[PDB]
Nucleic acid binder design. Sequence first.
RNA 1: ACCUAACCAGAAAGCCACGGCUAACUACGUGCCAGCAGCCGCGGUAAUACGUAGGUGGCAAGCGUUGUCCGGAAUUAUUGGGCGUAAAGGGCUCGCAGGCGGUUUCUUAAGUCUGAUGUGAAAGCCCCCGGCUCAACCGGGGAGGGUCAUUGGAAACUGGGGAACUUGAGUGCAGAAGAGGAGAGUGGAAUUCCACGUGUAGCGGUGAAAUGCGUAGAGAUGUGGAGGAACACCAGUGGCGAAGGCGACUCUCUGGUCUGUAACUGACGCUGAGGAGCGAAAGCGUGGGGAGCGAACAGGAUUAGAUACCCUGGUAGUCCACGCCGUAAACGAUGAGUGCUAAGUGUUAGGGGGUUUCCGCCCCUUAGUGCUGCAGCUAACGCAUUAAGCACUCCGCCUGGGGAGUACGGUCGCAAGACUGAAACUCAAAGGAAUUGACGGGGGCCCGCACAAGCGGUGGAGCAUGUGGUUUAAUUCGAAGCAACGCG
RNA 2: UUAGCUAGUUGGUGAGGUAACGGCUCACCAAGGCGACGAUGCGUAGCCGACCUGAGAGGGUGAUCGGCCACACUGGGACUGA
Lengths: 137, 165, 131
Amino acid sequence: PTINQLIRKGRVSKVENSKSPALNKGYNSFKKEHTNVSSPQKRGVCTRVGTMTPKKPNSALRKYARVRLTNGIEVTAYIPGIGHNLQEHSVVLIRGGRVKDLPGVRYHIVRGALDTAGVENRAQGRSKYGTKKPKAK
Amino acid sequence: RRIDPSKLELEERLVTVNRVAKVVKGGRRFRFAALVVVGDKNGHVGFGTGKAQEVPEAIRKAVEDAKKNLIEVPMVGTTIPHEIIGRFGAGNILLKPASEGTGVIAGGPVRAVLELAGVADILSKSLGSNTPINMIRATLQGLSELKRAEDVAKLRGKSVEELLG
Amino acid sequence: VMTDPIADMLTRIRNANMVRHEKLEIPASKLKREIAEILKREGFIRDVEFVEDSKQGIIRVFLKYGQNNERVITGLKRISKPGLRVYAKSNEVPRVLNGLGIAIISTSQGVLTDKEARAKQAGGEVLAYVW
RNA sequence: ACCUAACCAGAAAGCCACGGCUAACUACGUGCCAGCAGCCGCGGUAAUACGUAGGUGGCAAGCGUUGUCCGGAAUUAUUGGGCGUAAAGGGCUCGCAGGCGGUUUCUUAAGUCUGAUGUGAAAGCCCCCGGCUCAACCGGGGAGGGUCAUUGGAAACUGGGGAACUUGAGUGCAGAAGAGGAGAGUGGAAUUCCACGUGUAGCGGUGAAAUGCGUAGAGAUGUGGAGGAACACCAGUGGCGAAGGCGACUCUCUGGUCUGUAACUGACGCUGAGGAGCGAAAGCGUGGGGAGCGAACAGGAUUAGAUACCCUGGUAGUCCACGCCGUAAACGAUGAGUGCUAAGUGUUAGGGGGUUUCCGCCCCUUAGUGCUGCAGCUAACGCAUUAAGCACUCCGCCUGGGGAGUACGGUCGCAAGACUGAAACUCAAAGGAAUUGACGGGGGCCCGCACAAGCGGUGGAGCAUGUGGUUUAAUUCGAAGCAACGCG
RNA sequence: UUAGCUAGUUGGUGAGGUAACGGCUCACCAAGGCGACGAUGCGUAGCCGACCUGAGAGGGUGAUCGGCCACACUGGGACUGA
C-alpha cells in the first residue's frame, strides 16, 4: 500500500466473531432490546432432557437438551458429568464453552448450579461436576 | 572461509529429530531425520545434520554434520556488533544487541543456536518461517553476517575505535 | 521520470556496490556533491572527482572496497523517502548501525554525518542511511 | 492499635493438573458404554487421556471454569506484509481534482531544526528519600507528557518568488516502415443453386452401417448464369495498434511509432480515485443479406440407457448499416513511468563507419521483438536489461474455505443481465510448488504356454472324491480369487 | 447498501431584547449558504486527567479519587435572587 494510498484510503479492520451468544440481556421492562451486557453465565428455565448423537467418528451418548435462557435465546447446552438431576421443567445455569462432538452446543450448564444437581459419587476433582467435600472418615 | 577444524569441546545439542518416510511400494520406509547443532561454547557453533535408521544413528550423522561446518559469530561480550534482522530462506530472525544482564531471550532454534554458541544478552524474536531447518538456516546466515567493530574499522579504512559509544 | 535524485545515486552506489565495478557514475547535483564529500570523507569510496562540463553533471566515484567482498559501501538504505519524509530532532537523531555504519542527516548548517551532527546536536531531514 | 505475663502445638490447607503444547505416573474397574476435551484428539477387555486409589507437579488462604480487553497476532504491516502460479493487477485508454518531480543561483521561513517565556492543576506512571515492625500504603522531593501558543536564530532539504541552463518532454528538418482506422470501388480461386449437353446405377457417409440423394436421369464431366461469405500462395515464436484485435487489390480522409543530425522552447513531466471513451464472441431492437458453416429441432446409428460423441439434414446466428449491450483463461494470470546492473545468439525498421563504383563482410549505434544464460530474487518452478533484480513516484487489488459473487438495497440496461455487494450457520482445513510410489483403456523397450501355431482335453454321459446348499439328535473343526474345492 | 441538505436557512438594513456581539427574535430587501477536506441522515456513546495491555508504535475501558458538561418521576414554564 502506497503512502498516499494507505494515507488516504485507510486500513480495514479485523473484527472477529464472538465466542457465544449471551447478550445481556435483554431487559424487557419495557424495551426488549436489550444487549449487549454479556454476563458471565445466563441461568434459565430448561426445555427438555434427552440425548443427541455424537459427531463422527465418536460413537457415544452425550445427553444435552435445550435451555430457554432468561433473556430470550434458546441455545442447547451439553450438561456436564455422569448422572444428572436435571429433568423437564427444571432450570439450569448455562455457562460458556463450545462442545466438541455434536454440532451446536453453545453452552455447558454448570453441574453444581442453583437448579441443577452436582456430580454424585465423584471425588477426584470437584470444581467441575460441583460435588461437595470428600467422604467423611 | 576458513573451515575451522574440530579442535575443541563440542556441545552437541539436538534441535529436533523429525520423522521421515519415503512412500514406496509397501507402506512407508520410515527413517529418522535430526538436525542437531554442535557448539564450541566460545563461538564455533555449527548446525547441520542428516538421516539414519535409528535415533542414535541420527545422532551420529548429526554429529558428523557438526564436524562438517562451524561459524565465527564475532561479538564483544554478550552482544553482536550490529543487531541486524538476519534471515535467509523465507524465515527471518530479529536479533538486536542487548545489555549485559538482559539474558539470551530467543526461541526454539534461536535459543538452541545462540544458547549453545556463547550468548550473554541478545534479544531475539523471529518474524517469518517456523521450520527447524529454516530457523537454523536464517539464524546461521544472520549470525554469519553480523560484523565486528575492530575488523569493521580494519577493512573500511576510517579508524579503529573511531566509531565508539 | 526523476522521482528522487538521492535515491538514484543510492541505487547507483548500491547496484554498482554489488556489481564489483571499479568506477561509478552519478547525476551531478548539490546532493551528489555534498554527499560525495561526506561519504568520501568518511572513507567508503576511493575518490570522487566531479568532472563537470556542459550541460549538467556529472560525478564519477570509485568503489573503495578491496579484495574482501563488501567494502566500505556494505549496504545503503533510503532512510528518508522523498514522498514521505523522515524527520529527526536533536535528541532523536538516530545513529544507524549501532557501531559499524553511519547515517547522514542533512543538518541546518550542512550535510553532516551521524556523530558530527550529534556533535552539533541539531537534526534535520534524514538524507540517507548507509548501513 | 500496640506492649507485658502465663497457658497450650494445642484450634489454622485446600484447589487444579500428571500424552503433547506443559511441571507432574502407575494400578483396578469400564470396554466406542459411561465419559473427557482449550487444540491435537483419546475410549470397540493390557487406556501414562474415562472414573476410582497411591504417588508426583504447579500454586496457596486460596485454586480452577467462564465472560470481556490487550499480547502472541509481522494475522492491517508508518515502524513491519504483499499481488506469475497460494488471496491480490483494474480488460484498456484519455483526462480534471489530487500525489510526486531535471541542474545553477538571490530572497523567504510556510514547512524542517534549535534557544527563552507561558501553559499542559492535583492524584496517578518512572526516578530519589523519609513515615506505618517491613510490605501493600502514605507523604515529601523530582522527572516526562503538546503539528500548543508567544518569541529569537540557522537556510542544508520540500515549498513561495525572481533570474537562469538543457539531456527530460515538445516543436522543427530529413528519412524509414507497417494486416493502425473510416468510407467507396474492383478482382479472382472454391462451395451451393439453376439452365442445357454427355452418361448409367449407383452417389453419399462410417469404426461398421443406416437415415438421406439417385431410372422424375444422380454422382462425375462440359458450358454458361445468379448470389453470399472469406481471401490460399507471399506468411514467419514477421509487422502495426492503448487493448480487443487487424490480411485479396486500388483510391480518398486520418491517427500513431521509430531513426538521424540537430534550428527552437526551457521542465511545459510521471501517475491519476471519480468522470469520459473503446472493448472478441454470444446475445438485444429495427431494416436489409442469406452461398458455406450452424445451437435449438428431425431422422439413422453406437450403448443396458444416448435429452451426448458419430453421420445425414436443419431454424436462429454468422454478413451489412443504424443503436443497446461493456462480459472472457479481456493472459505475459506480471498496472504505468524512470535510472542502474554479466554475457552470447537470432529478427525486422533505421542510422554512423572500415576498405569497398559495385556487391558483400565486420564494428559501433538506436528502436522493437525472440531464444540461451551471470549477478540478484524465490517457497519451488522459474524471471533475469522486455526482471518477478536493484531503488524512487502514483493508482488499483488482497486478509482462510464453504455459505456466496448468492440474498437485500441502489445505478444502468429494451431485455438478457452488468456493476456494487453482505450475513446467520459451519469446518480445521482449503491452497501453491516439489518428492516418493500407484494408476492410465498414455506413449516407448522387453520377457514368459501369455497370445498366435498345433496336440489333447474340460463344460455333454455313468462313476470316484471335495465344496456349496437342504436335512439332522449330530451331519465335528479348518480352508472360500488364482493362492477354497482328489485341501489338512 | 446515507448525495444531497438548508428558507430564519445565507447575507444585508432597521427595530426590539439579554450581562453581551450575534437571525438571538421580528419587519423590509437580496438569493444565498454547506458538501468528497463527507454536508445531512441512521447508529452508538457522557468527555478528559487517566486505567489495563504491548518492547515500542499502537489496541481496549471511562469503575472507585478528581475536572468539566448534562439530568433530577416525564414534558414545558417562569418567580425569588448577585
